[PDB]
Each structure stands twice: as C-alpha cells, then as structure tokens.
Design a protein around this ligand. Structure first.
Ligand SMILES: CC(C)=CCC/C(C)=C/COP(=O)(O)OP(=O)(O)O
Ligand SMILES: Nc1nc(=O)n([C@@H]2O[C@H](CO)[C@@H](O)[C@H]2O)cc1F
Ligand SMILES: Nc1nc(=O)n([C@@H]2O[C@H](CO)[C@@H](O)[C@H]2O)cc1F
Ligand SMILES: Nc1nc(=O)n([C@@H]2O[C@H](CO)[C@@H](O)[C@H]2O)cc1F
Ligand SMILES: [Zn+2]
Ligand SMILES: [Zn+2]
Ligand SMILES: [Zn+2]
Lengths: 157, 157, 157
C-alpha cells in the first residue's frame, strides 16, 4: 500500500535576511516573519509527509505549547516528524517540492536543498525533487510580499 | 495500480454566518457566497476523487440541467460522486485536505470533519487527513476576503 | 511501485489572443505574456511529470539560456520531457490538471485538451483528467490579471 500527502506554507517578508529555504541559507534584502526559522519549503514538505501518515500537521506535533521542541529549526522538526512517521512502519516513496517566490533565485541553492532533505529522510536523492517558480509579478508573491511553497509526498505502507 | 487526483476551490465571504466546512457549521462574522452551501473542503475533496477517477469535476457530474441535485448540500454530492466513482471499480486509498483561511479557527472542528468524510466515503478515520493553515495576512485569504482549500486523493483499482 | 509529482504555473494577460491552454487555441480578448507560448496547463503538467521523475523542472531541461528551444511550443516541450522520462524507465499512471481562470470558459475546449495530452503522453484518455475552476473574483486570477494552473502526476516504475 502507498499514501499521498500534501503540504502548503506561506511566510511574509520582514526583519533582516538572509533567508532559510530547504535548510539552505539564501542571501537577500529582507527576511521572513516566522514562529521558527520559517523555512517554508521544509514546513510544507513536513506537512505533506505527516499528511500521508494522517498525523495531521506540524502544528499538531509541535505546538507553541510543548516546550520539548520549542525553538527548534525546521531541519530538526523534519527529522523528528520523520522518525514518528517511521514508527508507524512507513518509509519514503518519493517527494516533490515546489517553491513559489518572485525572488531570490533558488537554482544555485537547489542542489544543496535536495542533498539536505535526502539526509534528513535517509533516502536516495533520486527520491527528492525541488523546483522553483514565479507567479510572473501577480499576487502577493509577485509583489514580493512573501514566499509560498507546495509539496507532495508518497509514503509506503 | 493507484490513481491520483487533485482538487482546489475558493469562496468569498458574504452575507451572514455561519460557514460550513467539512460538513461542520462554524460560527463566523460573515458566511460564504455560493450557489451551493459553500463547503470548500468538500468541494475540493470531491474534485480530487473525481479527478483521480478521471470523471471531470462537480460541474460535470452535476450540470445546471440535472434537477436531482439542485440545492443539495455538499455531503449529498460527495456521496453521489462516491457512488459513481465506486461504480467504475475504484476503492479509497487515502485523502489529504488543506483548508486555507485566515479565520475562523478550524482546529476544534477538524475531528468532526474527519468523522463525516469517513462516513461519507465508508473508510477508517485513518484514511482521512484534514489540516488548516493561513497565508500570514497575504493574498485574498490573508485580507479575509475568502477561504480556499486544496485536496489530494489516491484511488485504488 | 509509483512516483508522485506536482507542477504549478502562472502567466499574465497582455497582447492579443487567443490563449493556448492544454494545446488548445481558445479565443479571448487578450493573450498570455510568455517567453513560451504561455500554456500554463502544459507547463504545470510537464513540471509534474519531471517532478515525479526527479528530473527537475522545465527551467532545468530547457533553460532560457539555451537558444536551442527558442520558438518551441509547450506540446513539443511536453513530448521531449516525456521521452527523457520514459528513457529513465518510467511509464504513465495518471495525470490531473486544474486550470484556475476567471475567464474564459474552458468547458467547450476541455475534451480536446485531453486528446492532445493523451496522444502526447501515448496513453489512454482515461488516464488524463482536466478540470477548470474560478477564484470567485478574488486574487489576481479573480481580477482577470492572469491564469494559474496546478497539476498532479503519477508515474509507474
Ligand atoms: C494563497 C494562494 C491561494 C495561493 C495559490 C495561488 C493563487 C491562485 C493565489 C491567489 O491569491 P493572490 O496572491 O492573487 O492575492 P492578491 O493579488 O489579491 O493579493
Ligand atoms: N484557519 C486556521 N485554523 C486553525 O485552527 N489553524 C491552526 O493553526 C496552526 C498553525 O498555523 C495550524 O496547525 C492549525 O492547527 C490555522 C488556520 F489557518
Ligand atoms: N525563484 C526562482 N528561482 C529560480 O531559480 N527559478 C528558475 O527559473 C526557471 C524558470 O522559472 C525555474 O525552472 C528555475 O530553474 C525560478 C524562480 F521563480
Ligand atoms: N474558467 C473556467 N471555465 C469553465 O469552463 N469552468 C466550468 O465552470 C464550472 C463551474 O466552475 C466548472 O465545473 C467548469 O466546467 C470554470 C472556470 F473557472
Ligand atoms: Zn511556516
Ligand atoms: Zn464551491
Ligand atoms: Zn509557463
């Protein structure tokens, strides 16, 4: 048996950069108002994998309430989310991540994101796709007011 | 094999509360404008299941011609879409639903939404993920102009 | 066993039409602005196919850098991507494509899109599903500033 999951995340710009996307530090004018590192790509991926497990969302495992993972970075959370998902007997099929930002340009840093995620998930990189796209200057991303990320995932049994 | 489907729906706030999400009446300042009951979560789920089965979308199972379902609430539609989907010999894999609203708060109502979808698709609650997230005041969701919802689904032959 | 992919595309209105969506020339008041033919439906799908394959995206296979695919249309890019995907030993499971447009009406032209896609992907039409929906006047789509599209794909190993 196999399982579909889906992740969505948005953070607005604010403060001073740089920014944290897919574990990778990316140089940029502004930063991201967030309850943690605000790694939008990792959050969505995390929500997507938990969704395939039906373990709800990251908000559910890691409330601002629990003191246990309070102040953890996105890479930490993804590792713990994953271990819990694995506890349910699941393993990785594959994952696809879609970054939506007018700027900065992601491509230089994408190869590094995919390496970062594959370690955190202990899979081949063949199982990790990341990509970036614009909304051609339309919407809140277009006006450069924020970054958005979707992600999909397939878990196995 | 298994079949993927995707669903996306939006409604604007307008008129008087309450709003109906995943079959659950959620008190709110305004309500959702729709020819239907405005249940974006179920409309999106229904389209994902229909899409997985290659059956079009709601507009194609329920055209302004067919009087049978004029004014029928979103759960009745979901079950008929399910009937027609089953009739092709598909069973449910799992589903994942992401409600995108700045407000109201969805968390206490999600367990019930998950309950109703389970019934309506005759499955374990284990097969059904519902999550909620915001766009941090950005876009039309952020400014409180409406609610969106994304859904993915996996069918089995 | 199987592999999920996801693709998202957006183009803006400018210039004369018609627009080309899913390979289909649809008459409309304005056209889409793009380096390409503007086909967000074939692009988003292409990206979903390449994401399933961990083959990257369109920006990676056919960059703006390389003037070799100057004048290439979305279907040509689609069949090329698919060739490369098949060469890595993948077949098609199914695809689901969701057009997000306030206007024009996509219904008359949808069945044809499916034909073009299935022939391009060398599959049965029952493996292709395409639907259309509005944002109910909300957002950049809602105000008629552009057309978004979102696609999911499932490949077979
Ligand atoms: C946040 C969402 C729903 C993302 C998915 C892409 C989409 C269709 C956005 C529309 O909102 P918008 O960004 O156009 O809002 P606006 O231009 O009104 O601020
Ligand atoms: N409309 C919303 N209702 C919620 O309950 N939430 C909760 O907030 C947490 C963090 O965003 C989410 O995990 C959800 O539990 C989010 C929403 F956007
Ligand atoms: N923020 C972005 N960063 C990128 O590197 N890109 C690259 O440009 C190509 C065309 O959109 C993309 O495929 C990606 O390689 C796009 C973005 F929107
Ligand atoms: N741009 C659109 N074109 C359509 O044909 N449609 C049709 O309208 C029905 C109701 O949204 C849909 O089912 C689709 O058939 C929707 C769109 F948003
Ligand atoms: Zn976040
Ligand atoms: Zn609706
Ligand atoms: Zn494009």
């Amino acid at each position: 048996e196999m399982r579909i999951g889906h992740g969505f995340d948005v953070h607005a710009f604010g403060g001073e950069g740089p920014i944290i996307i897919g574990g990778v530090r990316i140089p940029y004018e502004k930063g991201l108002l967030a309850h943690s590192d605000g790694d939008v790509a990792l959050h969505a991926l995390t929500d997507a994998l938990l969704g395939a497990a039906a373990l709800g969302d990251i908000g559910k495992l890691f409330p601002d309430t629990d003191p246990a993972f309070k102040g953890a970075d996105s890479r930490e959370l993804l590792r713990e989310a994953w271990r819990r998902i694995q506890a349910k007997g699941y393993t990785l099929g594959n994952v696809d991540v879609t970054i939506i930002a007018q700027a900065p340009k992601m491509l230089p840093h994408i190869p590094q994101m995919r390496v970062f995620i594959a370690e955190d998930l202990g899979c081949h990189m063949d199982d990790v796709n990341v990509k970036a796209t614009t909304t051609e200057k339309l919407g809140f991303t277009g006006r450069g007011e924020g970054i958005a990320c979707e992600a999909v995932a397939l878990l196995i049994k």
